[PDB]
Amino acid sequence: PRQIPFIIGNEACERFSFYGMRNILVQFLITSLLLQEVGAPERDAEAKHILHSFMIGVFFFPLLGGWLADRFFGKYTTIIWFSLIYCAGHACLALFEDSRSGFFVGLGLIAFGAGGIKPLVASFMVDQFDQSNKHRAKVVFDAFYWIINFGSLFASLLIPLALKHLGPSWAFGIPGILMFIATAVFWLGRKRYVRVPLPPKDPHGFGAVVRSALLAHAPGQGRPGLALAAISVLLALACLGLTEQLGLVICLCMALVLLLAGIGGGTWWQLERARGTHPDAAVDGVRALLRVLVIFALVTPFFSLFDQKASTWVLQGREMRMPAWFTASQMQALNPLLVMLLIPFNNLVLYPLLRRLGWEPTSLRRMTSGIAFSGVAWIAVGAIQVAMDGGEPMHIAWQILPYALLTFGEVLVSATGIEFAYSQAPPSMKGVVMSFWYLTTTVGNLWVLLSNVAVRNATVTSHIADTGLSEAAFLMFFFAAFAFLAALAFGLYARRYRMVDNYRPANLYFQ
């Protein structure tokens, strides 16, 4: 279709721009006048707080983007308006580089813009193909895989060099211009796009079945699931009262986790009461979605460990030996390079080997192994830190070891997770699966924010100061242990999981 190049152009510029600004954020922040803390470990925590709060927004706002597009404006209009807000955020990073208030408004606008378009770009692309040629979108999804990885790789190698040698106006200015170009290119194909109707309200969709499950009465029982859901709404509201000691972003996230557990768990309790009102394939479909929500919840520590390569690992990298021309942030280029090497290594070498050897590399085995390997990566990061803390000069090339381990974990759990959930949930409920997957990253980033608060406590600080390890080394070993515990909890849940496939072919678009 003649409109597809405008979509490819917009996707390439926006992805390069996103990774470009995100992957220099902590290195820019740590030497800036934008941090209010004065002590070195307090400033590390503050820079992590900003990055991980930004990641929270990026992966939470798809909820708003999808809702506005599906219920009111369609995908084209929603993409355009979120992309312009996105541009305004990039312009704020320019207009307010030396202003804490303006630069944070800029990050807020970028998070909102990037988050809002995220569940829309891929869906709008598929809409461009006629209903009998939907399978041909696979070729474009394959191009998105290469575009995301090459864009992330180049952004990680180039933008930190612009920061180091040219300064912040150039380093944030380049992604800003690319986002303007991404928005302009999307707009240039406007007269050629297919603009499909708003999705019809499904009387047997996820929301309707949850509504019927919670509200339906049963003789001589009552409604304890609705009660649990009501109590979770009250506990979520109580969180807004902890803004003083935890900050608004943590409070809003803890409230989100409470609402997911209470309403989800409450729906699980009374889901059988929907069986009459709904066609069974709808009720079973919601049961399958709730089992997926548990699998996704258990994967959140992987994202706690994964998203810290742009914060905690950069901060470590800065203290390591390197040539004058190199900068710590450039190490982030190893992740997309390793994804591009390891996706075909696992697909063409490792999985076929394992299959021939008798150990079937099932989707749940890959996921358990994936969380465990992210834990192993953090044992390596911590061991590197312990060598650094003991006065040993460590070359930054030592970070290749945890990058390899972590990216191996990513290919095993992150690339598998979404494909696994799609295979188990009804294909008509794919949007719900995706919303829960985005929230998996939001929740993993919350665990990082919570760890920052926990270490700032004078009692925890004294326990750390007595442990012998630095705050960074303690936190690294803590995250490794957290991933190992998560791998164990995931594996025990996976053991009792019954695979019930939908038998509908689907996907290299996981990042």
Ligand SMILES: CCCCCCC/C=C/CCCCCC(=O)OC[C@@H](O)CO
């Ligand atoms: C349900 C969760 C929604 C969260 C929305 C988050 C919106 C994104 C914001 C990115 C900018 C982060 C600025 C935070 C910040 O610097 O806080 C001040 C902090 O340094 C004090 O410790």
Ligand SMILES: CCCCCCC/C=C/CCCCCC(=O)OC[C@@H](O)CO
């Ligand atoms: C390591 C952190 C794990 C907790 C993450 C919290 C995110 C929220 C998750 C929703 C709660 C689980 C849903 C409960 C539910 O429906 O269970 C059904 C389950 O028993 C099916 O086997």
Ligand SMILES: CCCCCCC/C=C/CCCCCC(=O)OC[C@@H](O)CO
């Ligand atoms: C510096 C290049 C980074 C990107 C690496 C991409 C690796 C993907 C290769 C495609 C699948 C293997 C096809 C068979 C083949 O010719 O393998 C040789 C070589 O590509 C193996 O890395």
Ligand SMILES: CCCCCCC/C=C/CCCCCC(=O)OC[C@@H](O)CO
């Ligand atoms: C199946 C994959 C297994 C991978 C095993 C490796 C996992 C990590 C182990 C910790 C070693 C981290 C490297 C740090 C190190 O060697 O520092 C000591 C020394 O070199 C300091 O001069």
Ligand SMILES: CCCCCCC/C=C/CCCCCC(=O)OC[C@@H](O)CO
């Ligand atoms: C996708 C490409 C990523 C490129 C960066 C990651 C590879 C590691 C680089 C370490 C910093 C540059 C040092 C170059 C150099 O002289 O290397 C020799 C060094 O390995 C000896 O220890």
Ligand SMILES: CCCCCCC/C=C/CCCCCC(=O)OC[C@@H](O)CO
């Ligand atoms: C040419 C093939 C390279 C394959 C690399 C990917 C597999 C992972 C390897 C682990 C590398 C460990 C780090 C080695 C390192 O930095 O040594 C320390 C040395 O640079 C000190 O000068």
Ligand SMILES: CCCCCCC/C=C\CCCCCC(=O)OC[C@@H](O)CO
């Ligand atoms: C590089 C040279 C080309 C310059 C292109 C200039 C236009 C740039 C960006 C798009 C502006 C969008 C303005 C808002 C708009 O059209 O909204 C329509 C919306 O309300 C309904 O779909």
Ligand SMILES: CCCCCCC/C=C\CCCCCC(=O)OC[C@@H](O)CO
């Ligand atoms: C000291 C500077 C603080 C900077 C704070 C940054 C805030 C920036 C952007 C957020 C824009 C408001 C979006 C809120 C909104 O309408 O969300 C509705 C949504 O929660 C419904 O799901």
Ligand SMILES: CCCCCCC/C=C\CCCCCC(=O)OC[C@@H](O)CO
């Ligand atoms: C593993 C290969 C990945 C692709 C590499 C793409 C290269 C793009 C950007 C980074 C270039 C950095 C080169 C800087 C450099 O070597 O400077 C040395 C300096 O002393 C001048 O001689």
Ligand SMILES: CCCCCCC/C=C\CCCCCC(=O)OC[C@@H](O)CO
């Ligand atoms: C897509 C962006 C294109 C425009 C920007 C291209 C420039 C990229 C990176 C900066 C290169 C370093 C410039 C030379 C320089 O000052 O070297 C540092 C040092 O040798 C002197 O202080």
Ligand SMILES: CCCCCCC/C=C\CCCCCC(=O)OC[C@@H](O)CO
């Ligand atoms: C589209 C990709 C290629 C990008 C090429 C470079 C043009 C992009 C952005 C322009 C940024 C200009 C920043 C001007 C500025 O404030 O300079 C002040 C000072 O830093 C001068 O060195």
Ligand SMILES: CCCCCCC/C=C\CCCCCC(=O)OC[C@@H](O)CO
């Ligand atoms: C619907 C989303 C709206 C956007 C929300 C954006 C929130 C942005 C910034 C909040 C900054 C909180 C500052 C307070 C804080 O965290 O203080 C540190 C605390 O540990 C007390 O020492």
Ligand SMILES: CCCCCCC/C=C\CCCCCC(=O)OC[C@@H](O)CO
């Ligand atoms: C279409 C995109 C714009 C085309 C421009 C691509 C620019 C590619 C690479 C940037 C040059 C990196 C070289 C950095 C370098 O060696 O700096 C000097 C050195 O002494 C300090 O790093």
Ligand SMILES: CCCCCCC/C=C\CCCCCC(=O)OC[C@@H](O)CO
């Ligand atoms: C510091 C906490 C350590 C906790 C132990 C971590 C062990 C590492 C990875 C988890 C492996 C999977 C757990 C066992 C499991 O579920 O096995 C089921 C399997 O036998 C079915 O074939």
Ligand SMILES: CCCCCCC/C=C\CCCCCC(=O)OC[C@@H](O)CO
């Ligand atoms: C600390 C070293 C970590 C190394 C990687 C972790 C160990 C490797 C594989 C464990 C996979 C357990 C998966 C459990 C699972 O899905 O069981 C379901 C199965 O029993 C259904 O028949």
